[PDB]
C-alpha cells in the first residue's frame, strides 16, 4: 500500500569549521610541497576547487568553503568535538575524502547525556569509487604531488550523509579518530515533520 507524504521546509545550518582546520589537503603550484592529503604528500589542485569563504551547493545541499590558513584547509579527523546549534536534526552532510576508503563513527551528543554512535563511510581521494552510495562532490582532472602537477589523475571528494534518528536536541558531534579521514565542509539538516498528505 502506497500513500503520499507532504512537502517539507527543512533548514540547512552551515558549520564554521575554520577554527578546527589542522591539515593541508589542497595546494597551488607554488606550494606543492605543503600537500598532506596522504603520507605521500599528494593534495587536491586549488585551481579546480571553490574559493575560500564562498557559498556552494553540491546535489542541492549548501556548504561554506573553508577560510584556509597556511597550516589548514580541512579537518583531518582526530576525534574533534564540533559544537552545533542546539536543535532536532535529520541528517549530517559532509564533503569528505579518505586515504583509501574507510568507515568509522560520528558521535551525536544530546542535551540529556545520550551520545549516539552514527556509522560514517568515506570513499578514496585517489580516483575513488563510491563504496557507501555517496554522491560525487568534486572530481578534478589533475592531482598535486610534492614536486609536480599530475595531468589525467582525478582527485575525488564525496558528499556523504549520516542519519540522526534520535528525537532529541543535539548540541555537538565528535568526528572520527582516524588520520585517513578528511572533512572539507559540514552542513546539518534540521528535522521537518513529514506526514500522510491531508
Amino acid at each position: 500500500l502506497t500513500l503520499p507524504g507532504t512537502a517539507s521546509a527543512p533548514e540547512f545550518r552551515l558549520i564554521d569549521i575554520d577554527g578546527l582546520l589542522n591539515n593541508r589537503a589542497t595546494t597551488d603550484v607554488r606550494d606543492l610541497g605543503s600537500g598532506r592529503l596522504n603520507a605521500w604528500g599528494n593534495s587536491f589542485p586549488a585551481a579546480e576547487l571553490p574559493a575560500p569563504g564562498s557559498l556552494i551547493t553540491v546535489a542541492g545541499i549548501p556548504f561554506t568553503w573553508a577560510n584556509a590558513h597556511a597550516r589548514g584547509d580541512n579537518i583531518r579527523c582526530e576525534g574533534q568535538v564540533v559544537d552545533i546549534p542546539p536543535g532536532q536534526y535529520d541528517w549530517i552532510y559532509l564533503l569528505a575524502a579518505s586515504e583509501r576508503r574507510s568507515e568509522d563513527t560520528i558521535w551525536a551528543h544530546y542535551d540529556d547525556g545520550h551520545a549516539d554512535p552514527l556509522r560514517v563511510g568515506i570513499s578514496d581521494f585517489l580516483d575513488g569509487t563510491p563504496a557507501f552510495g555517496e554522491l560525487s562532490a568534486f572530481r578534478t582532472s589533475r592531482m598535486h604531488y610534492p614536486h609536480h602537477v599530475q595531468e589525467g589523475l582525478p582527485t575525488t571528494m564525496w558528499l556523504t550523509r549520516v542519519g540522526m534518528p534520535r528525537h532529541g536536541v543535539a548540541r555537538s558531534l565528535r568526528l572520527p579518530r582516524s588520520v585517513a579521514m578528511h572533512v572539507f565542509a559540514l552542513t546539518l539538516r534540521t528535522a521537518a515533520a513529514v506526514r500522510l498528505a491531508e
Binding site: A39, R100, R101, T129, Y145, P146, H148, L153, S178, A180
Partner: protein, 330 residues
C-alpha cells in the same frame, strides 16, 4: 589485454587479473574467493607486490581455490630476448619494474618504487606495456626506458621508505592455469567460505602469524614497539607493505560475496560482504596511522592500538556473518 584494478588494489592483483582475463577467467572469482591473514617475520621485501605465498607460488596463494600457478625468472644479458620468446609461446610476462624509470608513471625521475606491469608486445624499438594502476597506461614505451626500469637498482629513496631498496633485477613472473577451473556454484562458494573461516580460526604456528589469533599477536607485537625508534620504523614499513595486498584481498573477497549475493538473491552473502568490507576498511585505519607515524613522525600509539583493536573486532564479526552465509548456500 584488459586493464583491471580496484581502489584498494596494487599492481599485484592488477597484473594477475590481466593474465586471468586473457585466458577467459573471472578475476573476481579467482582472486576474490581466497581470504586470509599471514605474516612471516623477516619474509617481507620493500615491494608494492609483496605477499607471503610459501609454500605455494605467488599466483598459487592469491588464487588458492584455482589451479593457477606462477614462476619467478631473472633474465640474463642486456636485451628482452627471453620476453620475446615468452610472448611468441603465448605467455604474458609480468615484469618487475621501477616507476622512477617509467615515463607514464607520476614517479618518473622523481621517486623509486618496486612495481609490476604486463608486457604484451615487443618490436625492435618498443616494449608495449599495460599498467592499470592510476593513472592507467596501455601502449608502447621506448625499449631503452623499459630496460632502464627492468634493470633498475631501485636504490634506497628518502621519498619512498616502503618500496625502494629492492632492485628490479630483470625479474619477471610467468602465470599459467594448469587445469580446468572449478564451477563456482552455491556448494563451491559455501566450501570456499567455510575453508576461509576455518583457516582464520586455526591457532597459528609459532613461526607464522596466521588468521584471527595471528592478527591479534602481530598487532600486539606492533603496538609494543616505542614510536620513533628504528625498531618501530622497521615494523611500520613492514606493516604498510604487507597490509596493501592483505587489504586488497579483503576488498576483492567482499566484491566476490556481493557478486554471488546478486547472482542468487542470497542476502546472507551481501551481509557477509559488509563484514569483510569493514575488515578492508579497518586495514585503512591501522596502515595509515602507521604510514603517518613512519613518514611524518606523527606518533599516535593510542590511535594505532584503537584501530588495531577495531580491526580484530571487525574480523571476529565478519567470520560469524560468513558462517551464516555458508549455511545459506550449502
Amino acid at each position: 589485454v584488459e586493464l583491471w584494478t580496484r581502489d584498494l588494489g596494487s599492481c599485484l592483483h592488477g597484473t594477475l587479473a590481466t593474465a586471468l582475463i586473457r585466458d577467459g577467467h573471472d578475476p573476481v572469482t579467482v582472486l576474490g574467493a581466497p581470504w586470509e591473514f599471514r605474516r612471516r617475520p623477516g619474509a617481507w621485501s620493500s615491494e608494492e607486490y609483496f605477499f607471503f605465498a610459501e609454500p605455494d607460488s605467488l599466483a598459487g596463494r592469491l588464487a588458492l581455490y584455482h589451479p593457477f600457478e606462477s614462476t619467478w625468472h631473472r633474465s640474463d644479458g642486456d636485451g628482452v630476448d627471453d620476453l620475446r620468446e615468452a610472448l611468441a609461446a603465448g605467455v604474458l610476462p609480468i615484469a618487475a619494474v621501477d616507476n622512477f624509470h617509467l615515463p607514464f608513471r607520476p614517479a618518473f625521475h622523481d621517486v623509486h618504487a618496486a612495481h609490476l606491469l604486463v608486457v604484451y608486445r615487443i618490436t625492435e624499438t618498443e616494449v608495449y606495456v599495460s599498467d592499470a594502476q592510476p593513472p592507467a597506461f596501455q601502449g608502447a614505451i621506448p625499449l631503452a626506458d623499459f630496460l632502464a626500469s627492468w634493470g633498475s637498482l631501485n636504490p634506497p629513496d628518502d621519498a619512498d621508505v616502503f618500496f625502494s631498496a629492492s632492485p628490479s633485477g630483470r625479474r619477471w613472473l610467468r602465470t599459467r592455469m594448469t587445469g580446468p577451473v572449478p564451477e563456482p556454484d552455491r556448494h563451491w562458494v559455501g566450501r570456499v567460505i567455510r575453508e576461509n573461516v576455518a583457516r582464520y580460526r586455526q591457532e597459528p604456528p609459532a613461526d607464522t602469524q596466521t588468521g584471527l589469533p595471528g592478527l591479534r599477536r602481530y598487532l600486539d607485537e606492533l603496538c609494543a614497539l616505542t614510536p620513533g625508534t628504528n625498531a618501530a620504523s622497521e615494523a611500520l614499513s613492514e606493516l604498510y607493505v604487507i597490509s596493501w595486498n592483505i587489504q586488497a584481498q579483503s576488498g576483492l573477497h567482499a566484491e566476490f560475496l556481493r557478486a554471488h549475493s546478486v547472482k542468487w538473491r542470497i542476502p546472507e552473502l551481501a551481509e557477509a560482504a559488509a563484514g569483510v568490507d569493514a575488515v578492508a576498511h579497518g586495514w585503512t585505519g591501522v596502515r595509515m596511522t602507521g604510514a603517518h607515524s613512519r613518514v611524518w613522525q606523527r606518533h599516535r600509539p593510542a590511535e594505532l592500538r584503537g584501530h588495531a583493536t577495531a580491526l580484530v573486532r571487525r574480523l571476529e564479526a565478519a567470520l560469524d556473518l560468513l558462517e551464516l552465509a555458508a549455511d545459506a548456500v550449502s
